[PDB]
């Protein structure tokens, strides 16, 4: 039940772990996200294995249209994912 | 490192646990959120103990201005909180 804040900084260090390869700045493009998603969120988000699904999501975070998901853009990812968790019918 | 999806459904069942008292529908007002926040996110969000801080956040999720945070509105809460986690300087 009680996990205190390990779930917040937990998801944060998780993103830092699966999304580690970037340019000069923390670009963290769809490559890293796709990796994290297919292996971590494999059971949460509908067909998170699908690049079409991942594209949809990535593009939903990357409103910048620059192919970069920051921890903040990943924050919206967790929005999609938590939705996929409770609304696990298919947040889509 | 690897927590798979326990962090997504984890936060979800966490909200379900600390925010359990509602009306006929899952209203889940600032009372339940304040509780979860002060005890869970006590170390993450800046002065999450402050009702002024919590108000700011709650109101940020409750765009409906109806005093109801759903799991989806709590989804934006986790957006604030994950931000408070990595950007732990003070998402504010």
Judging contacts by C-beta atoms under 8 Å, the chain B residues touching residue A46 are none
Backbone φ and ψ for B68, nearest 5 degrees, come out as -140, 120
Binding residues of B, by number, are 16, 19, 22, 24, 26-27, 32, 62, 64, 66, 68, 73, 86, 90
Judging contacts by C-beta atoms under 8 Å, the chain A residues touching residue B74 are 82
The 8-class DSSP code of residue A66 comes to S
The rounded distance, in Å, linking the Cα atoms of B34 and A84 is 24
Q: What domain range includes position B18?
A: 1-92
- Tell me how long chain B is: 92
- Sign of CA pseudo-dihedral A44, B61, A14, B13: negative
In sequence order, what are the residues at sequence separation of 6 or more whose Cβ sits closer than 8 angstroms to the Cβ of residue A10? A3, B3, B7
Provide the 3-class DSSP secondary structure of residue B88: coil
CB B69 within 8 Å of CB B28: yes
Q: Closest chain A residue to B82 measured between Cα atoms?
A: A8
Judging contacts by C-beta atoms under 8 Å, the chain A residues touching residue B87 are 71-72
CATH code of the domain in which A61 resides: 1.10.238.10
Provide the 3-class DSSP secondary structure of residue B25: coil
Residue where the block lists tokens 């493009």: A29
CB B71 within 8 Å of CB A82: yes
Count up the domains in chain B and report the number. 1
Token digits for A73? Answer: 């853009």
CB B40 within 8 Å of CB B14: yes
The upper half-sphere exposure of residue B6, i.e. CA atoms within 13 Å in the direction of its Cβ, equals: 9
């Amino acid at each position: 039940m009680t996990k205190l804040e390990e779930h917040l900084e937990g998801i944060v260090n998780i993103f830092h772990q699966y999304s580690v390869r970037k340019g000069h700045f923390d670009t963290l493009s769809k490559g890293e996200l796709k990796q994290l998603l297919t292996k971590e969120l494999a059971n949460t988000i509908k067909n998170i294995k699908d690049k079409a699904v991942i594209d949809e999501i990535f593009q939903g975070l990357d409103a910048n249209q620059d192919e970069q998901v920051d921890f903040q853009e990943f924050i919206s990812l967790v929005a999609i994912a938590l939705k996929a968790a409770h609304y696990h019918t298919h947040k889509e």
